[PDB]
Ligand binder design. Structure first.
Ligand SMILES: *[C@@H]1O[C@H](CO)[C@@H](O[C@@H]2O[C@H](CO)[C@@H](O[C@@H]3O[C@H](CO)[C@@H](O)[C@H](O)[C@@H]3O)[C@H](O)[C@H]2NC(C)=O)[C@H](O)[C@H]1NC(C)=O
Ligand SMILES: *[C@@H]1O[C@H](CO)[C@@H](O[C@@H]2O[C@H](CO)[C@@H](O)[C@H](O)[C@H]2NC(C)=O)[C@H](O)[C@H]1NC(C)=O
Ligand SMILES: *[C@@H]1O[C@H](CO)[C@@H](O)[C@H](O)[C@H]1NC(C)=O
Lengths: 99, 99, 99, 102
RNA sequence: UUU
RNA sequence: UUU
RNA sequence: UUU
RNA sequence: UUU
């Protein structure tokens, strides 16, 4: 399915989403273990290891690096927020390595 | 139908609300798709394009610029939070173009 | 009942809670309208006016000033967070007018 | 059961989780009170964290110290500060924030 | 200041 | 420090 | 920029 | 680094 997480304290807050429904979902690092909703919210207490979610038979890995890139965008968007027409695009340009 | 989002990492965390219930909702860029509940919470993994949400036969467009204006208000409210009587209105005055 | 909100972009993210269940809840400025569970979460798009909630025939007002005090505590706890034994109480001492 | 909280305004936003289901959960300060299978997880808030987070869940007393919540916010804060170096930001923040760590 |  |  |  |  699709997994989206943002940082929360020392860990992460996540959503799993599948348009046709989430039938099973588990994680070695996060508090989710269920075997039909299309959205499931869960947390990960630490992100020392990357976020690993098994969802509908598919292994998903959201790297902690990827989470930090997303936090970078949030932080620099806020820093530039008196220029609201350009803040988000400026933050993406600074924060995403391969651009 | 009302849509409200705040920034979350690289994207947005959102709610769609309709007092008499949401009968259908979709988005080209956000994780929501329904073909009756008052409230639906969903996320948008990116806001490089503005948040476009279809709800109850209406096209809703929340500009990323509008989301950054709201983040500006949050950020400057916190900056000024030792002056809790005026911090919010000061933040609105700085952050909302025109005022 | 009990109402607790924190700041979210230009507005607030809130919860109402009542030990014996929430039978009625509404608000002139927040997206909540029910006419039975212990807890409901709702958002307020703006806090230019204080957050006013009617819950179980009781009128609840959380002042924006109060919200900002709470955000002060959050912000200065983060600022002092390399001293985790005293960061929270230090933030309360700086941020709460009656101390 | 398991309890994880992060700071929210003057208090905390929390989640409790038990693999076999949460049947009883209460708190001397947080807004949670359930008695009676049932759901694996419940979200609740605490309006203040002056006196740590104490949760009675499935007969066991859980205490998440405010100090621990602040270490966690330290990691969030320094990860953000270091976020232009996304390969190392989290590890750096842990190294700085977790007392005694080497 | 979510239109 | 949500009254 | 959640793969 | 939620014990
Ligand atoms: C959650 O809390 C409740 C109450 O605090 C616990 O209820 C307890 O349940 C056991 C059996 O499941 C009760 O024992 C039974 O007592 C009756 C007489 O009242 C007897 O006829 C039965 O044969 C059995 O011995 C126990 O009395 C009851 N406790 C109280 C205070 O009423 C429940 O077990 C808790 N669940 C978890 C997972 O902690
Ligand atoms: C989503 O639901 C709305 C609400 O019922 C639909 O709106 C009406 O749909 C009927 C069906 O064709 C039309 O005759 C009306 O003119 C519509 N009214 C309005 C105000 O939109 C809408 O068609 C539905 N759309 C989708 C894509 O499901
Ligand atoms: C809601 O319930 C209360 C308590 O029963 C009642 O007094 C009130 O009239 C109801 N409606 C509103 C709008 O408060």
């Amino acid at each position: 399915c699709t997994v989206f997480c943002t940082l929360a304290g020392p860990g992460a807050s996540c959503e799993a989403y599948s348009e046709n429904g989430i039938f099973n979902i588990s994680s070695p690092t996060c508090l989710v273990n269920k075997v039909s909703e299309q959205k499931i919210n869960f947390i990960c207490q630490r992100v020392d290891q990357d976020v690993v979610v098994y969802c509908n038979g598919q292994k998903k890995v959201i790297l902690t690096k990827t989470l930090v890139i997303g936090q970078c965008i949030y932080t620099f968007t806020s820093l530039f927020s008196l220029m609201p027409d350009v803040a988000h695009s400026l933050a993406v340009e600074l924060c995403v390595p391969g651009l």
